[PDB]
Design an enzyme around this catalytic site. Structure first.
Site, PDB file in Angstrom:
ATOM      1  N   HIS A 166       0.860  -1.179   0.000  1.00 18.51           N
ATOM      2  CA  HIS A 166       0.000   0.000   0.000  1.00 18.51           C
ATOM      3  C   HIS A 166       0.896   1.228   0.000  1.00 18.51           C
ATOM      4  CE1 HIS A 166      -3.869  -1.920   1.851  1.00 18.51           C
ATOM      5  NE2 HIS A 166      -3.954  -1.822   0.537  1.00 18.51           N
ATOM      6  N   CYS A 262      -2.499   3.366   8.695  1.00 21.75           N
ATOM      7  CA  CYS A 262      -3.491   2.414   8.205  1.00 21.75           C
ATOM      8  C   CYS A 262      -4.724   2.353   9.092  1.00 21.75           C
ATOM      9  CB  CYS A 262      -2.883   1.015   8.100  1.00 21.75           C
ATOM     10  SG  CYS A 262      -1.555   0.816   6.918  1.00 21.75           S
TER      11      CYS A 262
HETATM   12  N1  LIG Z   1      -3.154  -0.885   5.192  1.00 20.57           N
HETATM   13  C1  LIG Z   1      -3.051  -2.065   6.026  1.00 20.57           C
HETATM   14  C2  LIG Z   1      -3.963  -3.217   5.623  1.00 20.57           C
HETATM   15  C3  LIG Z   1      -3.550  -4.499   6.304  1.00 20.57           C
HETATM   16  C4  LIG Z   1      -4.437  -5.684   5.924  1.00 20.57           C
HETATM   17  N2  LIG Z   1      -4.075  -6.909   6.632  1.00 20.57           N
HETATM   18  C5  LIG Z   1      -4.360  -5.911   4.392  1.00 20.57           C
HETATM   19  O1  LIG Z   1      -3.558  -6.796   4.011  1.00 20.57           O
HETATM   20  O2  LIG Z   1      -5.100  -5.223   3.639  1.00 20.57           O
END
Ligand SMILES: NCCC[C@H](N)C(=O)O
Length: 273
Positions: A166, A262
Protein backbone atom coordinates in the site's frame (compact mmCIF):
# COMPACT_ATOMS: atom_id res chain seq x y z
CA UNK A 1 -11.41 23.96 9.34
CA UNK A 2 -12.12 21.04 11.67
CA UNK A 3 -10.03 17.90 11.22
CA UNK A 4 -11.83 14.61 11.75
CA UNK A 5 -10.35 11.11 11.55
CA UNK A 6 -12.26 7.83 11.26
CA UNK A 7 -11.09 4.80 13.25
CA UNK A 8 -12.57 1.36 13.99
CA UNK A 9 -11.82 -0.47 17.26
CA UNK A 10 -10.26 -3.95 17.41
CA UNK A 11 -13.26 -5.71 19.00
CA UNK A 12 -12.95 -8.54 16.45
CA UNK A 13 -9.29 -8.15 15.52
CA UNK A 14 -7.08 -11.15 14.76
CA UNK A 15 -4.74 -12.35 12.05
CA UNK A 16 -6.90 -14.96 10.28
CA UNK A 17 -5.42 -15.10 6.77
CA UNK A 18 -2.33 -14.13 4.79
CA UNK A 19 -2.76 -11.44 2.12
CA UNK A 20 0.53 -9.57 2.57
CA UNK A 21 4.02 -10.72 3.59
CA UNK A 22 3.81 -9.32 7.12
CA UNK A 23 0.94 -11.70 7.89
CA UNK A 24 2.95 -14.83 7.00
CA UNK A 25 3.52 -16.94 10.10
CA UNK A 26 1.34 -14.59 12.16
CA UNK A 27 -2.06 -16.31 12.03
CA UNK A 28 -3.49 -16.17 15.57
CA UNK A 29 -0.26 -14.60 16.86
CA UNK A 30 -1.90 -11.29 17.80
CA UNK A 31 -2.94 -10.68 21.40
CA UNK A 32 -6.42 -9.15 21.23
CA UNK A 33 -5.99 -7.62 24.69
CA UNK A 34 -2.66 -6.01 23.77
CA UNK A 35 -4.12 -4.85 20.45
CA UNK A 36 -6.93 -3.16 22.39
CA UNK A 37 -4.41 -1.39 24.62
CA UNK A 38 -2.27 -0.31 21.66
CA UNK A 39 -5.28 0.93 19.72
CA UNK A 40 -6.59 2.85 22.73
CA UNK A 41 -3.24 4.60 23.16
CA UNK A 42 -3.19 5.50 19.46
CA UNK A 43 -6.80 6.71 19.62
CA UNK A 44 -5.99 8.94 22.60
CA UNK A 45 -2.89 10.35 20.90
CA UNK A 46 -4.76 11.13 17.69
CA UNK A 47 -7.69 12.59 19.61
CA UNK A 48 -5.35 15.10 21.25
CA UNK A 49 -4.77 16.45 17.72
CA UNK A 50 -8.08 15.90 15.88
CA UNK A 51 -11.68 14.82 16.37
CA UNK A 52 -12.01 11.03 16.08
CA UNK A 53 -15.16 9.40 14.71
CA UNK A 54 -15.70 5.64 15.00
CA UNK A 55 -17.36 3.02 12.81
CA UNK A 56 -18.60 -0.13 14.53
CA UNK A 57 -16.47 -3.18 13.61
CA UNK A 58 -18.00 -6.23 11.96
CA UNK A 59 -17.32 -9.73 13.25
CA UNK A 60 -15.53 -11.85 10.67
CA UNK A 61 -13.71 -8.89 9.05
CA UNK A 62 -10.67 -8.39 11.30
CA UNK A 63 -8.94 -5.94 8.96
CA UNK A 64 -11.80 -3.44 9.33
CA UNK A 65 -9.57 -1.74 11.92
CA UNK A 66 -7.57 -0.48 8.92
CA UNK A 67 -9.94 2.32 7.99
CA UNK A 68 -7.40 3.95 5.65
CA UNK A 69 -8.61 1.38 3.12
CA UNK A 70 -12.32 2.21 3.48
CA UNK A 71 -12.21 4.70 0.61
CA UNK A 72 -10.69 7.91 -0.70
CA UNK A 73 -12.25 11.16 0.57
CA UNK A 74 -12.20 14.63 -0.98
CA UNK A 75 -14.70 17.22 0.16
CA UNK A 76 -18.18 15.71 0.39
CA UNK A 77 -17.22 12.84 -1.95
CA UNK A 78 -15.77 9.39 -1.36
CA UNK A 79 -14.54 6.79 -3.83
CA UNK A 80 -15.37 3.55 -2.02
CA UNK A 81 -12.64 0.94 -1.99
CA UNK A 82 -13.08 -2.26 -3.97
CA UNK A 83 -10.70 -4.70 -2.33
CA UNK A 84 -8.41 -6.95 -4.32
CA UNK A 85 -8.90 -9.83 -1.85
CA UNK A 86 -12.18 -11.52 -0.97
CA UNK A 87 -10.92 -11.58 2.63
CA UNK A 88 -11.58 -7.82 2.90
CA UNK A 89 -14.42 -7.40 0.37
CA UNK A 90 -16.99 -8.01 3.12
CA UNK A 91 -15.94 -4.74 4.78
CA UNK A 92 -17.27 -2.76 1.79
CA UNK A 93 -20.99 -2.67 2.78
CA UNK A 94 -20.13 -1.56 6.31
CA UNK A 95 -17.86 1.27 5.16
CA UNK A 96 -20.40 2.30 2.51
CA UNK A 97 -23.11 2.55 5.17
CA UNK A 98 -20.90 4.75 7.36
CA UNK A 99 -20.12 7.11 4.48
CA UNK A 100 -23.81 7.37 3.52
CA UNK A 101 -24.94 7.89 7.13
CA UNK A 102 -22.39 10.69 7.54
CA UNK A 103 -23.44 12.71 4.50
CA UNK A 104 -20.92 11.70 1.84
CA UNK A 105 -21.70 11.15 -1.83
CA UNK A 106 -20.29 7.72 -2.72
CA UNK A 107 -18.72 6.70 -6.03
CA UNK A 108 -18.30 2.98 -6.70
CA UNK A 109 -15.90 1.27 -9.07
CA UNK A 110 -16.76 -1.68 -11.29
CA UNK A 111 -16.66 -4.86 -9.21
CA UNK A 112 -13.67 -6.18 -11.18
CA UNK A 113 -11.52 -3.04 -10.71
CA UNK A 114 -9.63 -2.99 -7.40
CA UNK A 115 -8.78 0.22 -5.56
CA UNK A 116 -7.92 0.40 -1.86
CA UNK A 117 -8.65 3.95 -0.84
CA UNK A 118 -6.56 6.46 1.05
CA UNK A 119 -4.23 3.64 2.09
CA UNK A 120 -3.16 3.48 -1.55
CA UNK A 121 -3.73 7.14 -2.59
CA UNK A 122 -2.69 10.23 -0.61
CA UNK A 123 -3.19 13.88 -1.49
CA UNK A 124 -0.40 16.38 -1.62
CA UNK A 125 -1.18 18.42 1.48
CA UNK A 126 -1.53 21.68 -0.49
CA UNK A 127 -4.10 19.90 -2.68
CA UNK A 128 -2.08 20.26 -5.88
CA UNK A 129 -2.67 16.63 -6.94
CA UNK A 130 -3.32 13.11 -5.67
CA UNK A 131 -0.46 10.63 -5.41
CA UNK A 132 -1.91 7.22 -6.26
CA UNK A 133 -0.13 3.92 -5.79
CA UNK A 134 -0.59 0.78 -7.83
CA UNK A 135 1.15 -2.53 -8.33
CA UNK A 136 -0.20 -4.82 -5.60
CA UNK A 137 -3.71 -3.76 -4.57
CA UNK A 138 -5.11 -0.85 -6.58
CA UNK A 139 -5.18 -1.25 -10.36
CA UNK A 140 -3.57 1.42 -12.53
CA UNK A 141 -6.78 1.44 -14.58
CA UNK A 142 -8.68 2.79 -11.55
CA UNK A 143 -6.69 6.03 -11.57
CA UNK A 144 -8.59 7.79 -14.42
CA UNK A 145 -11.88 7.04 -12.64
CA UNK A 146 -10.59 8.78 -9.52
CA UNK A 147 -9.19 11.71 -11.50
CA UNK A 148 -12.60 12.36 -13.09
CA UNK A 149 -14.83 11.63 -10.09
CA UNK A 150 -12.79 13.86 -7.77
CA UNK A 151 -11.62 16.42 -10.38
CA UNK A 152 -7.97 16.04 -9.39
CA UNK A 153 -4.72 15.46 -11.19
CA UNK A 154 -3.51 11.96 -10.33
CA UNK A 155 0.21 11.18 -10.20
CA UNK A 156 0.51 7.40 -10.43
CA UNK A 157 3.36 5.70 -8.55
CA UNK A 158 4.31 2.05 -9.09
CA UNK A 159 5.10 -0.07 -6.03
CA UNK A 160 7.65 -2.84 -6.59
CA UNK A 161 8.25 -4.44 -3.14
CA UNK A 162 5.59 -6.79 -1.79
CA UNK A 163 6.34 -5.62 1.76
CA UNK A 164 5.30 -2.08 0.77
CA UNK A 165 2.08 -3.10 -0.91
CA UNK A 166 0.00 0.00 0.00
CA UNK A 167 1.26 3.50 -0.78
CA UNK A 168 0.86 4.57 2.84
CA UNK A 169 3.38 2.00 4.06
CA UNK A 170 6.22 3.72 2.22
CA UNK A 171 5.04 7.25 1.37
CA UNK A 172 3.57 10.05 3.51
CA UNK A 173 2.83 13.58 2.30
CA UNK A 174 3.29 16.04 5.19
CA UNK A 175 2.52 19.66 5.91
CA UNK A 176 5.00 22.33 4.87
CA UNK A 177 5.62 20.69 1.50
CA UNK A 178 7.56 17.77 3.01
CA UNK A 179 7.39 14.15 1.88
CA UNK A 180 8.41 11.24 4.13
CA UNK A 181 9.10 8.20 1.95
CA UNK A 182 11.15 5.08 1.19
CA UNK A 183 12.52 5.35 -2.40
CA UNK A 184 13.29 1.60 -2.86
CA UNK A 185 9.56 0.84 -2.68
CA UNK A 186 9.14 2.55 -6.09
CA UNK A 187 10.49 1.85 -9.55
CA UNK A 188 12.97 4.19 -11.21
CA UNK A 189 10.38 6.09 -13.24
CA UNK A 190 8.18 6.62 -10.18
CA UNK A 191 11.16 7.91 -8.18
CA UNK A 192 11.90 10.36 -11.00
CA UNK A 193 8.27 11.51 -10.96
CA UNK A 194 8.46 12.11 -7.19
CA UNK A 195 11.80 13.93 -7.53
CA UNK A 196 10.50 16.22 -10.28
CA UNK A 197 7.77 17.49 -7.95
CA UNK A 198 9.39 17.47 -4.49
CA UNK A 199 12.85 19.09 -4.31
CA UNK A 200 15.59 17.53 -2.17
CA UNK A 201 15.20 19.91 0.78
CA UNK A 202 11.57 18.76 1.16
CA UNK A 203 12.35 15.02 1.01
CA UNK A 204 12.62 13.13 4.30
CA UNK A 205 14.11 9.87 3.09
CA UNK A 206 13.84 6.86 5.36
CA UNK A 207 16.31 4.00 5.43
CA UNK A 208 15.27 0.36 5.38
CA UNK A 209 15.60 -0.11 9.14
CA UNK A 210 12.90 2.51 9.75
CA UNK A 211 10.85 1.49 6.70
CA UNK A 212 10.40 -2.07 7.99
CA UNK A 213 9.07 -0.68 11.27
CA UNK A 214 6.40 1.23 9.30
CA UNK A 215 8.01 4.65 9.86
CA UNK A 216 6.28 6.00 6.74
CA UNK A 217 2.89 4.84 8.03
CA UNK A 218 2.56 8.05 10.00
CA UNK A 219 -0.38 10.27 10.93
CA UNK A 220 0.37 13.96 10.43
CA UNK A 221 -1.88 16.70 11.83
CA UNK A 222 -0.34 20.17 11.36
CA UNK A 223 3.17 19.91 12.90
CA UNK A 224 2.49 16.69 14.85
CA UNK A 225 3.50 13.31 13.46
CA UNK A 226 2.33 10.10 15.13
CA UNK A 227 3.87 6.74 14.35
CA UNK A 228 5.27 3.45 15.58
CA UNK A 229 8.82 3.31 16.92
CA UNK A 230 11.44 4.96 14.69
CA UNK A 231 15.15 5.71 14.94
CA UNK A 232 16.60 8.76 16.62
CA UNK A 233 18.15 9.58 13.25
CA UNK A 234 14.71 9.94 11.67
CA UNK A 235 13.26 11.72 14.71
CA UNK A 236 16.01 14.32 14.48
CA UNK A 237 15.40 14.85 10.76
CA UNK A 238 11.70 15.37 11.44
CA UNK A 239 12.43 17.76 14.32
CA UNK A 240 14.75 19.79 12.09
CA UNK A 241 11.92 20.07 9.54
CA UNK A 242 9.62 21.40 12.27
CA UNK A 243 7.65 18.30 13.28
CA UNK A 244 6.81 17.09 16.79
CA UNK A 245 7.10 13.30 16.87
CA UNK A 246 4.84 11.13 19.03
CA UNK A 247 5.53 7.39 19.15
CA UNK A 248 3.07 4.78 20.28
CA UNK A 249 3.50 0.98 20.15
CA UNK A 250 1.60 -0.88 17.41
CA UNK A 251 3.29 -4.30 17.28
CA UNK A 252 -0.02 -6.18 17.26
CA UNK A 253 -1.09 -4.37 14.08
CA UNK A 254 2.26 -4.80 12.36
CA UNK A 255 1.46 -8.54 12.53
CA UNK A 256 -1.30 -7.76 10.01
CA UNK A 257 0.91 -5.45 7.95
CA UNK A 258 -0.46 -2.09 9.13
CA UNK A 259 0.39 0.69 11.57
CA UNK A 260 -0.75 4.15 12.68
CA UNK A 261 -1.72 5.61 9.31
CA UNK A 262 -3.49 2.41 8.20
CA UNK A 263 -5.66 2.60 11.36
CA UNK A 264 -6.95 6.05 10.35
CA UNK A 265 -8.85 7.82 7.58
CA UNK A 266 -8.98 11.60 7.48
CA UNK A 267 -12.60 12.30 6.53
CA UNK A 268 -12.16 16.11 6.32
CA UNK A 269 -10.13 16.70 3.16
CA UNK A 270 -10.81 20.28 2.05
CA UNK A 271 -10.95 21.21 -1.60
CA UNK A 272 -8.22 23.85 -2.00
CA UNK A 273 -7.92 26.36 -4.89
N1 LIG B 1 -3.15 -0.88 5.19
C1 LIG B 1 -3.05 -2.06 6.03
C2 LIG B 1 -3.96 -3.22 5.62
C3 LIG B 1 -3.55 -4.50 6.30
C4 LIG B 1 -4.44 -5.68 5.92
N2 LIG B 1 -4.08 -6.91 6.63
C5 LIG B 1 -4.36 -5.91 4.39
O1 LIG B 1 -3.56 -6.80 4.01
O2 LIG B 1 -5.10 -5.22 3.64
Amino acid sequence: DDIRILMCPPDHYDVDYVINPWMEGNIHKSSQERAVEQWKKLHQTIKECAIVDLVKPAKGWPDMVFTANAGLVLGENVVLSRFYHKERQGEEPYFKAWFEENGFTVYELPQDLPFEGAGDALFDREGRWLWAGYGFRSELDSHPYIAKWLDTEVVSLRLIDERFYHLDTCFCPLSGGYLLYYPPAFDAYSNRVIEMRIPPEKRIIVEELDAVNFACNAVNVNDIIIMNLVSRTLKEKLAEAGFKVRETPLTEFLKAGGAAKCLTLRVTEPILP
